[PDB]
Design a protein around this ligand. Structure first.
Ligand code: MG
Ligand code: ZN
Ligand code: ZN
Lengths: 99, 1345, 50, 521
C-alpha cells in the first residue's frame, strides 16, 4: 500500500481509509523516539504536524510541493487544539501567553 | 513599541481556574434548549445544542435562512436569524455556556485524591458530601456564638440553635453552603494564624502536617485562583463540530454521547428553573438540585458517581474526562501514534546488487508517493498545461512521467522503517531506486540493524517533504552515515550469513591442493590463477604483496614483501584499501575478525573507505559463497560411533542407583540427584565426542601417509564461521538433545537419548512439547517486558540533552578493569576508550604527562595507555557532570554512529534508553590462582601463628595478583580465619596454593599468645557439658541466650587471654585488654588452663537474575533479605536481647551516644562480636539495598553498584552496552535530594540537586556570607524519578490525566515547554538536535530586553 | 524517628515509625504492623549527622 | 484496636478497595510519598485491588419523602379548606384596589375599540359575546356608583363593587400582572418611606420611637414636619439641614394617594393582607403535594424504560401533581387520588414525548409511529415472516406513503463512540470521513485556475477585461448586473451585453482557450 494525500477523519483531522485508497501509515511513539534520538527535528515536526494533523499545514504544504518550493509553514495540530477546547469545556481555563 | 494583541507564535501556556465571567467570555451565546436539529429539514434549532446563531453556519460563507449567500457578505449578521456569514470552520471554534439555576460543585475538584475543596477548607470529604446532599447543615462564619465555623449540625440542632440566636450566627446547606464557605474564607488571616501556630508546638507530625498545608495555602494565594470558582455557576458547552451530529448511509445518524449528557444537564437545569418559579416544596427542589449535580458530574467526569448509561445503549456514555484521557493505558494523541500522509509500506526482500545507501522502491509506490512532486515537476518544464493536466498524465501513466519521476527521485531520500522500532536504527534513510515489482528491496547489511528477516516481514516508507527533512534524512538518518551501534562503538554493518561463509571459504586453507607451494607475483595473477581453474582457492602459497601504513604523520608509507598466505586470501587482498596491514586477511576470517577488519578500517582510513570496503566485502562474500557450492545433506551431520556405548554405561549407571534405593543404601531424594547428575554428565560426553569427531575429522595426505586439519564439512563450516548454527544447536542434531522437564519445573530423570537425525518416538516428542510451548510463551512475554522497560527508561530520561560544552570539572569515576573471579571479565581498554580523562594520568615514572588533563581518549591514546602498564584512568561522567539541567559534551563522551566526540544538542537520554532497551529481548572453597604473578594484600589485618603460617584477622580482606608489569590480573576476597602460605610482596606460580579455609567453620582465633582463662562461663546456665562418644575429647558448648536458664541468661561467656603471671595480655598497641566472647551454638576447642598461641582457634562456630533483575535494579527496589550494614563506625556489642529479636549496640571509639538497633537473631551474624567495624561493613551477608549503599557508602559507590550489577546481567548474556547510558539513567535516578539545614528553602523538602546546588552556590557569595543549606542525595527508582516533571503538559501524558490536570489547575502552573515530550504534543520543533538552535535563540530572546 | 523494616508477601521495605524510644519504636511498630499479617523484621534508629 | 489492621481487614473481607479508601485510613506516622506508594505495593501483593448516605438520590429522595406523614380522608378537607380561605382572600385584596378595577375597565375599552381580543382580558365571568358586553356594563355601573361616594356612605357600596369584580374570572396572566402592579406600588411606597426615614434617624440624628409617633396616620401633611421641628428637642433642631430633601420627596408620597386612590395607610394594609393570603395558600398547597408524593413514584414505575431516568419521571410527575393540587376542588366530591393520577401520568407522558429523543419530534408524530408499531404486531407471525413494508398503513387513515419517512427519522442515532469490530480502540466515529473538507489537490487546482483565468484576462483589451471581470465575480466582490456595468462604464445597455459576447468569442479559439481547456475534465 501507499498514499500521498487522501481522505480525512471528521472528528479529528487525520488520514483515513478512503474508499479503499488506503489511509496513511501510523507513526508511533517508538518511531517518535527514533526521530528524537537522531538530531532531526523538522522530519518529526512535518511528520506529526503538516503531513498529518495540521488542517492548514497539509494543503499549504501541497501547494508548495507542486510549486517546486520545499518548505513548511506549520501550525497547531488539530489534535492539541481539540484538547484545548475539551479541557476548556470544564471549569479549567487553559490559555497561551506572551508573544 | 506596542507589545502585542493578536496572534503571533505563542510562548508557553497557562492553566488555572475559570471565573464565571471568564467562562462567559468564551461563550458566544447561551444554549437554552435540549433540541438538536429540525427533525425534517435538518437544521440547527436556534438556542439548541447545535445552532448557527450561537456557533456557526452549516455551510461555508452562507447564512442559515439563506438571505445572504454571497462570499462578499462577511461581517453581516442576518436580520431574520442572526448568523454572521463566515466559514463553517468556526463551528469547530465557538464555545457556549449555560446559566445554572443552583450552584454545582466541580466533580474534579471535589473528588480528586486530595479533594481540593476539602483540604482548602480543612473540611473532611464525608462532611462536604453530607452537606451537598442536604443530609446536614453546616455553619458558616458562626461569629460569637455557641458554635464554631466548620462545625456541622442537623435539622433539630439547627432549629434549636436558630431558636437561640437568630442573628450573629449563620448556617446553610447544599452547594450554596460550600460556595459560601469558599467565598467567605480569608486566605491571608488563616495563613497568619497558621504561621503563629507553626512556631509554638515542637513536634514532627504537628509541624509537618501544618507546614505542608500552609505551603499549599500560600501557593493557592499566589496562584491567582479563587475558592468560589471551585463551585460552578456557569457551565461551558463544547463546540458542536467536536460532538458532530453527522448523518450516515441508510438515513441513520450518529452523534457523540456528549450530546446526550449535555441534553440531560440542560433539561434538568431548565426544570429546576421552572420549579423555582412554581414555588415547589423543598423536598422537590432539593431532589432536582441533586439531580442537576449528578448530571453535571456525569458530564464532566462519568463513573465517579452513578456511571450513567446512554440512550438505547447499555454501554456507559463517554464524558469529557474520558475525551481528554483517551485509552490504551496512558496515551494522549501524539504519543500512541497517528496517521501520516506521504507514506506507504510493503513486503520486503533481497537485492544485494544494492549499495549501502540505497533501496529498491516499487514503481507504483514511488509514483503514488511523490505524486504531488510529479505534478509540479511536469508543469514546471511545460510538459503539462496545468495541474489537472498533470494529474491526468500520471493517471494515464503516459510513458513520459516515468522519466519525469526519475528526476524527482534522484537526490530525494526516503525513510525506511520496521514494525518493532527499538533503537534509532529502526528508521533509516536510503536513496530510492525504481524497481519493477510490488516488493521493497532492502540492503542485506542493514538486516542486522532492523532485526528484519525475509520470512514475510513488512517495512514502511516515509517521504521527507520539507528541505530541512531531506537534509536531516541525508546527514543524520542516512544509512551510510550510521555504520555503528549507538550502544557500543562496534560496527553494525558487520556481514551476516552467506557473506561470512563466503569469506570464510575463501580465507580457509587446505593441506594439499592445486598450486601448493608455488609463488605468485601478486594478487592479480593469484586471482588469474584461480579463475582459470589452475590453482585451488585454498592452498599454501607465498605471494609478493604491497601493504601500506599511515604510520608517518598524516601520510601513507608503502612497503612490499613476500607474505606466506593462501591463494584465496591473496585474491581477497585486492579489496582491502591502503593502510591496513596484510595480517588482517591472513587469518581464517570468522564473523569476528571480519568485523574487526571493518572496525579498524574505520578507525584508520575514515568513513567513506569503510563504506566502500563494506560494500565490496558483501559483494565478494555473496559471490564466493555462491561459488563455494556449500550445501547441507543428511550425511553432513555425523553421529558419534561411541554414543551408543556412552548411553549403555550411563544406562547401567542409573541401574546401580536403582538397586541401592531398593536396598535402602541411598535415599529417594539422593537417588534422584545421583541419577540426574550421571544422566546429565553423559550428555557432556556425547556432545564433546561429536565435536571432536566433527571439527578435525577430515584426514588427508600430502606427498606421504596422513595429516589432519580442520574439517571442510559444510554444517561445521557454517557453525565455525559464524554464518549460522552453534555448538549447542549442532549438539541437538547429532548427539542426544538435553534432558527435558515436566511443567512442574522439575527435571525428568529420563533425558532424550535420540536426536533429530535419528527418529523420535512418541514419548520424547510429547516431552519436548512443553519445552517448545513454554519457550514460545516466554519469548512472547519478554517482548512485552522489554517494551515496557524501554518505555519507563525513555520516560525517566527524555529531556536530558547535551546543552553546555565543557563544564570543566575534575570530578569523575575511577576506571579499572572489572577483574571478576579468575581473570578479567572485561578489560580496561573497553571501559576507558571513548571517554575523556578527568585529570592528567601519569606513567609509572612520574613527572611525565602522556595524556594531558581532559582529552578524548581514542584508539591511539588507549593504545598508548596500553603500551604503559597503567591499570587505572579517572574519567568524567554524566553522573558527575556539574552542568545543571543537562550534560556537557566533555563529560558524556564520543560514541555515536560516528567516531568523533558527541555533538552539541544531541539528545543523549533517548538513545541511552534505546540502547539499554533494544538488546533486552535476549535476556532471561579455597583460593587458587590461575595465573603467574606477585601476591598483594589489600586492606587486611593479620597475625603469624605458632605453625609459621599466616592467619587473617580481618573480615574485609582482598587478594590481588600484581605481575611484574604492575597490572592487576586476579582479584579475590579472603574470609576471616583464612590461612595464607604467602604474604604481601611474595611470588607465586600458576595454580599455586595461596589461601585456604573452611566454609562451614568460622574459626575464632587469637592474635596474642598465652594460657586460656574462663570467665562468666557457668554450666547449666551460660554453657553446657557435652563429650563426644566417638573420641572423648570435649568442649563446653556455649548455650545461646535464647535457650538459657532464669538468671544465667544475663551473662556473656568469654575466653580471655592470660600470660604466665595470670595477667591479661592486651590488644597490641592499646590500653584496651583482650577478651574474646563467644556466641550461641559455638563449640569451643580447648578448655580452661590449656595454653595456646596465635592462629589457634579458641572456638569453632558452625553455619535472582535476567531482565526482571534489571527492572529491580533501575527501580532501586529493596530486596527481600537485605544485608544489614553498620550505620556508625565502631566496636559492635550485644545487649540483652528482647522480644524474639536481638539488640545490637554499636560503640563509637570517637565521640558518644552509642547507637542500638533491632536485629532478629535468627539471621546469622557476620561481624566479630568483640571487634570494631567501619561504617558500611557487613553485619550480615546477603543482597544489599541500593538506598543503604547511597547512604552508608556514597554516590560514587551506589552508581558503581548499579552499573556493575546491570552490566553483570547483560554481559552474562553476551551483550555489549557502554557504561555511559546506564550512567545517565543513574544521573536521572539520584537527581532528587532532601534538604537537612536551612536558611533559604524549607527544612525537609525533597528538591532537585540541580536546583539546590544552583541556589547554595548563589548563596556562597553576595546574599549572606553563606546562608546556604545542606542536603542529602536521594535514590529514586526510574518510575518515581520519571514522575517528577516541571511541564504539566508532559505529565498529562504518562501519568494519570485527571489528577495532573487538576493539581496543575489549582496551582496556576505555567508550562514553559523547554522539554521534548511537551513540545511534541503541542506540535513544534524539538528542543534538541536540529531544533536546538531555534529553541536556544528564543530562550535567549525570552527573559531579556 | 525510627525506620522499621517490615517484610511480607513477595518483598520487603522500611517505614518510618515515630517514637521516643527504640523499644517504644518496636512496640509501636508491631502494634501498628504485626496484626495485619505483616512480619516485623528489623528496627533501626535514625542517624543523620547534622 | 489497630488502624492498619482495620484498613487491611476492610481490604481483605471485601478484598477490594480504592485509593481514596486507603488514604482515609493510614498509620499515624505515614503522611508522605514513599510511605504510601510502597504501602500500596504491600497491599497489592495480597488482597490486590487498585483504582447512611449511599449517594444516589434515588435513596435520599425516597427517605426524605419517606418522612412525610400520609394524609387522612378528612385531613384533605382540612387542607383544601385552608386553601380556599387562603386564596379568595387575595382575590378580595385585588377587588379592593381601585386601579385593579380601572385597569379592567380600560382594557375593556381597548377590547371594544378593537385594540385587543377578549381571550386576553377574560375567561368568562361565572360562565357569549353579548352577555359579556352587558355584564361588563354591570361592572362599570357598580364602579360609577361608588366613584361619586368619596365624600361614610361609601363603605357600603365598596362591598358591592368587590362583589361584581369578584364575579369575573380573569386570565391568569392578567391577574398576575395586577398583583405584580400592586406589590410594585408598595415597593415605591417603601422607597419614599425609607428615603424620608434615613434623613431623620440615619442622618439627622433622631429616634425611631419619636419618628413613627407622628408619622403613622399622616405622613403626607406637615403636621409631623412644620409643626414638629420647633418642639425644642435634641433631635428637633437637627432637622433643619435636610428639611429640603424630605419635603421635596414627599410630593410623590402624596401622589400615590392619588394614583392608587388610597391613602398611604390603606395601601400597605391591602397589599399586606394579600401577602398573608398568598402565603396561606401556598403553605396549605405544598402540604397537600408532600402527602401525595408517593403516588407519583407509583405511577412513574410504569414509564421507566421509555428513555427517561427514574428521577426525571418522578420529578415531571411531581410537577403534574402540583398542577393537580392547583386545579382541584374538594367541593366536587371527586377523589383526589384518582383525579391527580391522570395529571401526573399526563405530565410524565408529555415529558417523555419530548426530552427522550436526540432529535425531538412532534407529539402527533410519536402517536402516528405508535399506531404503526401496534399494527406491525398482529401481522408478524400472521404473514409467516412479517408484513411487507408497503403493507401497514392500509388500515391507517392517511396516504400510506408515509411509512418510509416515518420509519426512517424515528430511529435514534447510533453513539459515535460505539466500539466497532476488532474490539480495539477503534470506534465508529473514528471511521467517519470528512466530506465537507476540500481536498488539497482541488484546492491547488483552484489556485492554478485563478492564476490561469487572470492570465487569459490579461490578454484582452482593458475595457474587455474590465467588463468581463465586472460581468462575473472575477477578482471583485458582488458580480454586477448588466445595467450596473454600464452605469460604471458610462455608455450603457445593449452596448455592454455586446462586448461580453465579443469577449467570449475571442476567448473561444484554441489559442487563448487551450490553456484553461483542460480544466473542463
Ligand atoms: Mg521474523
Ligand atoms: Zn438568516
Ligand atoms: Zn560535565
Amino acid at each position: 500500500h501507499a498514499r500521498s494525500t487522501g481522505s480525512y477523519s471528521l472528528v479529528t483531522q487525520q488520514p483515513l481509509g478512503g474508499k479503499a485508497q488506503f489511509g496513511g501509515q501510523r507513526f508511533g511513539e517508538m518511531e517518535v523516539w527514533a526521530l528524537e534520538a537522531y538530531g532531526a527535528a523538522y522530519t518529526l515536526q512535518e511528520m506529526l504536524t503538516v503531513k498529518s494533523d495540521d488542517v492548514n499545514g497539509r494543503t499549504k504544504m501541497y501547494k508548495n510541493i507542486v510549486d517546486g518550493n520545499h518548505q513548511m509553514e506549520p501550525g497547531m495540530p488539530e489534535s492539541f487544539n481539540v484538547l484545548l477546547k475539551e479541557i476548556r469545556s470544564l471549569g479549567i481555563n487553559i490559555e497561551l501567553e506572551d508573544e | 513599541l506596542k507589545a502585542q494583541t493578536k496572534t503571533e507564535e505563542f510562548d508557553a501556556i497557562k492553566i488555572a481556574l475559570a471565573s464565571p465571567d471568564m467562562i462567559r467570555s468564551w461563550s458566544f451565546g447561551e444554549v437554552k434548549k435540549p433540541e438538536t436539529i429540525n427533525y425534517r429539514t435538518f437544521k440547527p434549532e436556534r438556542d439548541g445544542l447545535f445552532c448557527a446563531r450561537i456557533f456557526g453556519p452549516v455551510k461555508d460563507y452562507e447564512c442559515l435562512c439563506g438571505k445572504y449567500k454571497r462570499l462578499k457578505h462577511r461581517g453581516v449578521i442576518c436580520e431574520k436569524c442572526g448568523v454572521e456569514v463566515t466559514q463553517t470552520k468556526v463551528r469547530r471554534e465557538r464555545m457556549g455556556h449555560i446559566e445554572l439555576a443552583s450552584p454545582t460543585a466541580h466533580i474534579w475538584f471535589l473528588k480528586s485524591l486530595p479533594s481540593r475543596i476539602g483540604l482548602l477548607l480543612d473540611m473532611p470529604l464525608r462532611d462536604i458530601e453530607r452537606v451537598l446532599y442536604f443530609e446536614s447543615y453546616v455553619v458558616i462564619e458562626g461569629g460569637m456564638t455557641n458554635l464554631e465555623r466548620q462545625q456541622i449540625l442537623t435539622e433539630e440542632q439547627y432549629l434549636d440553635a436558630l431558636e437561640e440566636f437568630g442573628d450573629e450566627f449563620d448556617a446553610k446547606m447544599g452547594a450554596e453552603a460550600i460556595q459560601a464557605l469558599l467565598k467567605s474564607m480569608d486566605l491571608e488571616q488563616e495563613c497568619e494564624q497558621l504561621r503563629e501556630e507553626l512556631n509554638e508546638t515542637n513536634s514532627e507530625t504537628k509541624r509537618k502536617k501544618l507546614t505542608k498545608r500552609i505551603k499549599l495555602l500560600e501557593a493557592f494565594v499566589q496562584s491567582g485562583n479563587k475558592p468560589e470558582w471551585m463551585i460552578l455557576t456557569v457551565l461551558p458547552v463544547l463546540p458542536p463540530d467536536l460532538r458532530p451530529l453527522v448523518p450516515l448511509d441508510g438515513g441513520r445518524f450518529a452523534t457523540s454521547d456528549l450530546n446526550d449528557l449535555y441534553r440531560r444537564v440542560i433539561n434538568r437545569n431548565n426544570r429546576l428553573k421552572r420549579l423555582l418559579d412554581l414555588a415547589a416544596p423543598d423536598i422537590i427542589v432539593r431532589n432536582e438540585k441533586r439531580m442537576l449535580q449528578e448530571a453535571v458530574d456525569a458530564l464532566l467526569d462519568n463513573g465517579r458517581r452513578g456511571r450513567a448509561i446512554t440512550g438505547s445503549n447499555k454501554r456507559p456514555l463517554k464524558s469529557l474526562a474520558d475525551m481528554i484521557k483517551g485509552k490504551q493505558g496512558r496515551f494522549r494523541q501524539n504519543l500512541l501514534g497517528k496517521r501520516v500522509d506521504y507514506s506507504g509500506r510493503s513486503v520486503i526482500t533481497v537485492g544485494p546488487y544494492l549499495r549501502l545507501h540505497q533501496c529498491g522502491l516499487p514503481k507504483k509506490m514511488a509514483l503514488e508517493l511523490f505524486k504531488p512532486f510529479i505534478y509540479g515537476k511536469l508543469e514546471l518544464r511545460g510538459l503539462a498545461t496545468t495541474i489537472k493536466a498533470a494529474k491526468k498524465m500520471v493517471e494515464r501513466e503516459e510513458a513520459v512521467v516515468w522519466d519525469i519521476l526519475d528526476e524527482v527521485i534522484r537526490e530525494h531520500p526516503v525513510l525506511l522503517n520496521r514494525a518493532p522500532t527499538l533503537h534509532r536504527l529502526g528508521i533509516q534513510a536510503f536513496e530510492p531506486v525504481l524497481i519493477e515489482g510490488k516488493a521493497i528491496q532492502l540492503h542485506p547489511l542493514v538486516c542486522a540493524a532492523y532485526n528484519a528477516d525475509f520470512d514475510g516481514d513488512q517495512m514502511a516508507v516515509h517521504v521527507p517533504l520539507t528541505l530541512e527533512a531531506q537534509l536531516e534524512a541525508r546527514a543524520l538518518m542516512m544509512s551510510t552515515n550510521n555504520i555503528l551501534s549507538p550502544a557500543n562503538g562496534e560496527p553494525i554493518i558487520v556481514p551476516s550469513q552467506d557473506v561470512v561463509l563466503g569469506l570464510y571459504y575463501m580465507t580457509r586453507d587446505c593441506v594439499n591442493a592445486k598450486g601448493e607451494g608455488m609463488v605468485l607475483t601478486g594478487p592479480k595473477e593469484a586471482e588469474r590463477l584461480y579463475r582459470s581453474g589452475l590453482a585451488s582457492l585454498h592452498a599454501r602459497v607465498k605471494v609478493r604483496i604491497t601493504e601500506y601504513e599511515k604510520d608517518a604523520n598524516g601520510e601513507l608509507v608503502a612497503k612490499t614483501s613476500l607474505k606466506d598466505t593462501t591463494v584465496g586470501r591473496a585474491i581477497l587482498w585486492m579489496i582491502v584499501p591502503k593502510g591496513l596491514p596484510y595480517s588482517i586477511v591472513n587469518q581464517a576470517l570468522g564473523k569476528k575478525a571480519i568485523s574487526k577488519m571493518l572496525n579498524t578500517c574505520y578507525r584508520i582510513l575514515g568513513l567513506k573507505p569503510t563504506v566502500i570496503f563494506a560494500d565490496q566485502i558483501m559483494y565478494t562474500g555473496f559471490a564466493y559463497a555462491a561459488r563455494s557450492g556449500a550445501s547441507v545433506g543428511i550425511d553432513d551431520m555425523v553421529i558419534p560411533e561411541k554414543k551408543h556405548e556412552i548411553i549403555s554405561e550411563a544406562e547401567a549407571e542409573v541401574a546401580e542407583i536403582q538397586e541401592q534405593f531398593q536396598s535402602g543404601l541411598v535415599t529417594a531424594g539422593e537417588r534422584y540427584n545421583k541419577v540426574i547428575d550421571i544422566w546429565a554428565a553423559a550428555n557432556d560426553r556425547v556432545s564433546k565426542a561429536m565435536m571432536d569427531n566433527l571439527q578435525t575429522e577430515t584426514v588427508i595426505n600430502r606427498d606421504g601417509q596422513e595429516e589432519k586439519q580442520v574439517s571442510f564439512n559444510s554444517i561445521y563450516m557454517m557453525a565455525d564461521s559464524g554464518a549460522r548454527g552453534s555448538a549447542a544447536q549442532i549438539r541437538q542434531l547429532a548427539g542426544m538433545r538435553g534432558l527435558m522437564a515436566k511443567p512442574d519445573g522439575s527435571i525428568i530423570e529420563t533425558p532424550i537419548t535420540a536426536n533429530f537425525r535419528e527418529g523420535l518416538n512418541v514419548l520424547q516428542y510429547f516431552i519436548s512439547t512443553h519445552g517448545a510451548r513454554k519457550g514460545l510463551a516466554d519469548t512472547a512475554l519478554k517482548t512485552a517486558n522489554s517494551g515496557y522497560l524501554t518505555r519507563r527508561l525513555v520516560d525517566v530520561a527524555q529531556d536530558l540533552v547535551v546543552t553546555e560544552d565543557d563544564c570543566g570539572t575534575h570530578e569523575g569515576i575511577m576506571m579499572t578493569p572489572v577483574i571478576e573471579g579468575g581473570d578479567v571479565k572485561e578489560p580496561l581498554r573497553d571501559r576507558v576508550l571513548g571517554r575523556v580523562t578527568a585529570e592528567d594520568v601519569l606513567k609509572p615514572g612520574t613527572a611525565d604527562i602522556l595524556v594531558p588533563r581532559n582529552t578524548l581518549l581514542h584508539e591511539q591514546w588507549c593504545d598508548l595507555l596500553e603500551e604503559n602498564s597503567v591499570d587505572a584512568v579517572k574519567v568524567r561522567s554524566v553522573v558527575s557532570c556539574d552542568t545543571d539541567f543537562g550534560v556537557c559534551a566533555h563529560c558524556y563522551g564520543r560514541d555515536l554512529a560516528r567516531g568523533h566526540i558527541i555533538n552539541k544538542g544531541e539528545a543523549i537520554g533517548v538513545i541511552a534508553a534505546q540502547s539499554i532497551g533494544e538488546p533486552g529481548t535476549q535476556l532471561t572453597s579455597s583460593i587458587q590462582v590461575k595465573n603467574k604473578g606477585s601476591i598483594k594484600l589489600s586492606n587486611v589485618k593479620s597475625v603469624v601463628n605458632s605453625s609459621g603460617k599466616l592467619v587473617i584477622t580481618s573480615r574485609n580482606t582482598e587478594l590481588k595478583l600484581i605481575d611484574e608489569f604492575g597490572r592487576t590480573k586476579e582479584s579475590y576476597k579472603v574470609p576471616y580465619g583464612a590461612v595464607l602460605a604467602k604474604g604481601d610482596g611474595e611470588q607465586v606460580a600458576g595454580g599455586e596454593t595461596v589461601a585456604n579455609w573452611d566454609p562451614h567453620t568460622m574459626p575464632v582465633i587469637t592474635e596474642v599468645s598465652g594460657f586460656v582463662r574462663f570467665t562468666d562461663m557457668i554450666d547449666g546456665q551460660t554453657i553446657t557439658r557435652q563429650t563426644d562418644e566417638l573420641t572423648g575429647l570435649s568442649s563446653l558448648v556455649v548455650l545461646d541466650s535464647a535457650e538459657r536458664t532464669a538468671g544465667g541468661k544475663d551473662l556473656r561467656p568469654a575466653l580471655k587471654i592470660v600470660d604466665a603471671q595470670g595477667n591479661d595480655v592486651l590488644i597490641p598497641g592499646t590500653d584496651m585488654p583482650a577478651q574474646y566472647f563467644l556466641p550461641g551454638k559455638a563449640i569451643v576447642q580447648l578448655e580452661d588452663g590449656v595454653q595456646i598461641s596465635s592462629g589457634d582457634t579458641l572456638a569453632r562456630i558452625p553455619q535472582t537474575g535476567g531482565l526482571p533483575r534489571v527492572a529491580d535494579l533501575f527501580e532501586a527496589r529493596r530486596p527481600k533479605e537485605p544485608a544489614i550494614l553498620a550505620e556508625i563506625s565502631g566496636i559492635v556489642s550485644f545487649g540483652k536481647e528482647t522480644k524474639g529479636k536481638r539488640r545490637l549496640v554499636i560503640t563509637p571509639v570517637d565521640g558518644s551516644d552509642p547507637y542500638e538497633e533491632m536485629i532478629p537473631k535468627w539471621r546469622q551474624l557476620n561481624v566479630f562480636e568483640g571487634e570494631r567495624v567501619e561504617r558500611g561493613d557487613v553485619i550480615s551477608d546477603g543482597p544489599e539495598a541500593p538506598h543503604d549503599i547511597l547512604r552508608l557508602r556514597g554516590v560514587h559507590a551506589v552508581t558503581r553498584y548499579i552499573v556493575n550489577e546491570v552490566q553483570d546481567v547483560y554481559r552474562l548474556q553476551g551483550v555489549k552496552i557502554n557504561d555511559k547510558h546506564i550512567e545517565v539513567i543513574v544521573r536521572q535516578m539520584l537527581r532528587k535530594a532532601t534538604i537537612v539545614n536551612a536558611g533559604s528553602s524549607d527544612f525537609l523538602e525533597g528538591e532537585q540537586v540541580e536546583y539546590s546546588r544552583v541556589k547554595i552556590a548563589n548563596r556562597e557569595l553576595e546574599a549572606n556570607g553563606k546562608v546556604g543549606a545542606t542536603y542529602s542525595r536521594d535514590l529514586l527508582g526510574i518510575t518515581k524519578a520519571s514522575l517528577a516533571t516541571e511541564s504539566f503538559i508532559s505529565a498529562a501524558s504518562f501519568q494519570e490525566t485527571t489528577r495532573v490536570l487538576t493539581e496543575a489547575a489549582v496551582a496556576g502552573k505555567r508550562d514553559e515547554l523547554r522539554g521534548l515530550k511537551e513540545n511534541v504534543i503541542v506540535g513544534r520543533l524539538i528542543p534538541a538536535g536540529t531544533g536546538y538552535a531555534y529553541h536556544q535563540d528564543r530562550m535567549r530572546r525570552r527573559a531579556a530586553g | 524517628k525510627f525506620w522499621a523494616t517490615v517484610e511480607s508477601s513477595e518483598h520487603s521495605f522500611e517505614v518510618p515509625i515515630y517514637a521516643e524510644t527504640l523499644d517504644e519504636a518496636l512496640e509501636l511498630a508491631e502494634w501498628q504492623y504485626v496484626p495485619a499479617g505483616f512480619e516485623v523484621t528489623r528496627v533501626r534508629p535514625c542517624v543523620a549527622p547534622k | 484496636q489497630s488502624q492498619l489492621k482495620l484498613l487491611v481487614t476492610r481490604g481483605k473481607e471485601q478484598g477490594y478497595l480504592t485509593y481514596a479508601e486507603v488514604n482515609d485510613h493510614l498509620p499515624e506516622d505515614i503522611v508522605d510519598s514513599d510511605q504510601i506508594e510502597d504501602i500500596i505495593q504491600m497491599i497489592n501483593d495480597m488482597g490486590i485491588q487498585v483504582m447512611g448516605r449511599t449517594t444516589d438520590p434515588v435513596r435520599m429522595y425516597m427517605r426524605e419523602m419517606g418522612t412525610v406523614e400520609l394524609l387522612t380522608r378528612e385531613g384533605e378537607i382540612d387542607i383544601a379548606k385552608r386553601i380556599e380561605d387562603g386564596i379568595n382572600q387575595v382575590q378580595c385584596s385585588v377587588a379592593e384596589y381601585p386601579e385593579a378595577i380601572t385597569y379592567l375597565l380600560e382594557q375593556y375599552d381597548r377590547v371594544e375599540a378593537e385594540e385587543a381580543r377578549l381571550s386576553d382580558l377574560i375567561t368568562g365571568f361565572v360562565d357569549d359575546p353579548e352577555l359579556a358586553r352587558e355584564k361588563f356594563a354591570e361592572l362599570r355601573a357598580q364602579y360609577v356608583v361608588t366613584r361619586d361616594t368619596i365624600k361614610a356612605t361609601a363603605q357600603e357600596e365598596i362591598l358591592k363593587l368587590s362583589e361584581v369584580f369578584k364575579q369575573f374570572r380573569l386570565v391568569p396572566k392578567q391577574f398576575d400582572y395586577l398583583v405584580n402592579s400592586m406589590r410594585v406600588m408598595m415597593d415605591r411606597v417603601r422607597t419614599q418611606e425609607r428615603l424620608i426615614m434615613k434623613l431623620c434617624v440615619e442622618q439627622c440624628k433622631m429616634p425611631k420611637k419619636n419618628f413613627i409617633t407622628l408619622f403613622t396616620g399622616n405622613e403626607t401633611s406637615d403636621t409631623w414636619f412644620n409643626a414638629a421641628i420647633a418642639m425644642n428637642k435634641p433631635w428637633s433642631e437637627k432637622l433643619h439641614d435636610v428639611s429640603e430633601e424630605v419635603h421635596r420627596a414627599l410630593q410623590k408620597l402624596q401622589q400615590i394617594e392619588e394614583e392608587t386612590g388610597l391613602t398611604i395607610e390603606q395601601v400597605k394594609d391591602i397589599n399586606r393582607r394579600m401577602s398573608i393570603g398568598e402565603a396561606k395558600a401556598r403553605r396549605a398547597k405544598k402540604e397537600m403535594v408532600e402527602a401525595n408524593l408517593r403516588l407519583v413514584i407509583s405511577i412513574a414505575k410504569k414509564y421507566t424504560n421509555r428513555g427517561l431516568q427514574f428521577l426525571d419521571l418522578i420529578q415531571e410527575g411531581n410537577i403534574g401533581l402540583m398542577k393537580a393540587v392547583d386545579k382541584f376542588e374538594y367541593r366536587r366530591g371527586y377523589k383526589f387520588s384518582t383525579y391527580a393520577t391522570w395529571w401526573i401520568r399526563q405530565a410524565i407522558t408529555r415529558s417523555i414525548a419530548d426530552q427522550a429523543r436526540t432529535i425531538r419530534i412532534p407529539v402527533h408524530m410519536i402517536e402516528t409511529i405508535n399506531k404503526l408499531n401496534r399494527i406491525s404486531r398482529q401481522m408478524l407471525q400472521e404473514m409467516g415472516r412479517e408484513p411487507t413494508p408497503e403493507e401497514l398503513a392500509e388500515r391507517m387513515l392517511m396516504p400510506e406513503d408515509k411509512i418510509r419517512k416515518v420509519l426512517k427519522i424515528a430511529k435514534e442515532p447510533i453513539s459515535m463512540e460505539t466500539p466497532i469490530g476488532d474490539d480495539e480502540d477503534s470506534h465508529l466515529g473514528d471511521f467517519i470521513e470528512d466530506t465537507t473538507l476540500e481536498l488539497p489537490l482541488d484546492s491547488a487546482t483552484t489556485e492554478s485556475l485563478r492564476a490561469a483565468t487572470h492570465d487569459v484576462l490579461a490578454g484582452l483589451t482593458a475595457r474587455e477585461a474590465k467588463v468581463l471581470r465586472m460581468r462575473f465575480g472575477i477578482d471583485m466582490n458582488t458580480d454586477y448586473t448588466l445595467e450596473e456595468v454600464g452605469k460604471q462604464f458610462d455608455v450603457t445597455r445593449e452596448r455592454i451585453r455586446q462586448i461580453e459576447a465579443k469577449a467570449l468569442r475571442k476567448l473561444r479559439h484554441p489559442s487563448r482557450s487551450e490553456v484553461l481547456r483542460s480544466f473542463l475534465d
